[model samples]
Target: GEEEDVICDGCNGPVVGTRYKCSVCPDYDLCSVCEGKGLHRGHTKLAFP
Candidate 1:
């Protein structure tokens, strides 16, 4: 299977679709769509469960 494009969990634009993922969680990833406008931003730190 092909690798799917990960959409931003925050804004739903596109994960890593534009700007790089948050400095803290590069791999933990979030798209530019959801960057500053989503729950990810609301959270103090970017971390995965």
Candidate 2:
């Protein structure tokens, strides 16, 4: 449903905050705001444009 749709993992808005994903492994996801703060500091992340 819409509730589960792609929304900002940071602000809980649409992923329009230039959605970012960080992962220590495949299928793992992280948000931009959190990413900026090093939410997953030990994890490896790759961002795609």
Candidate 3:
């Protein structure tokens, strides 16, 4: 089975490849592009499945 799609709060689009989740925010996630540029640096970064 294919993996479930994760929505990106930063871009409001489906996240592909690598995804970054914020520890502080509830259900907040960012795509690879957004994380690379340090969109939410204040919150801790966590790896997603």
Candidate 4:
């Protein structure tokens, strides 16, 4: 089955490639593509829309 992809609000990247929903807010999901890539680590949690 094809899974849905969540977009990151921080860098506006596609979360479907990697990572999962934010631990704090499921609605705010972060993609692995952006994980630890840059300043994203500075933020503890990410929120999805």
Candidate 5:
């Protein structure tokens, strides 16, 4: 699949690669790097392929 454009709430940057959506954040998202750092811990993360 092609990469999708998304914004990361963690670093406030553009995530042109993989992104993770926080199920409990209403609309919050994070990049793979941020997700790796364990951002939005305790929240269910949804990943985009």
Candidate 6:
């Protein structure tokens, strides 16, 4: 499958190490910091390929 990149909604930063994606928004992504802290608490997301 083709992967996508997006800005981190949590810190509004780049997905430097990794990018976790949301199933809702087409390009919603949260970086490792956001994923580690679960910063974007309200969204259902997963690690992308």
| lDDT digits (tens) for residues 5-49 of candidate 4 | 666766787755455455555476556655555534533664333
Extract clashing residue pairs from model 2.
Answer: none
Candidate 4, lDDT over the whole model:
0.57
- Can you tell me which runs of candidate 6 are displaced by over 4 Å? 1-5
lDDT of 3 by residue, 1-49 (tens): 9976788877888988887988889888999988877888889979765
Candidate 2 vs. true structure, TM-score:
0.47
TM-score of each: 0.34, 0.47, 0.76, 0.43, 0.79, 0.65
lDDT of each candidate versus the true structure: 0.51, 0.56, 0.84, 0.57, 0.86, 0.79
Rank order (by TM-score, best first): 5, 3, 6, 2, 4, 1
For candidate 5, the 10 contiguous residues with the lowest summed lDDT are 3-12
On lDDT, the leading prediction is 5
Candidate 3: pairs in clash: none
Q: How well does candidate 1 match the true structure in TM-score terms?
A: 0.34
In order of listing, the candidates' clash counts read: 2, 0, 0, 5, 0, 0
lDDT of 6 by residue, 1-49 (tens): 8975467888887788677888777778888887899776777887764
lDDT of 5 by residue, 1-49 (tens): 8975578888999975787998887888998998999988999989994
Off-target runs (Cα >4 Å) in candidate 3 are 1-5
TM-score top scorer: 5
lDDT of 2 by residue, 1-49 (tens): 4564545454555553444565655554555666676665676777653
lDDT digits (tens) for residues 1-49 of candidate 1: 8986756556555554354345566544565444445645533444342
Worst 10 residues of 1 by lDDT: 40-49
State how far residue 38 of model 6 sits from its true place (Å).
0.9
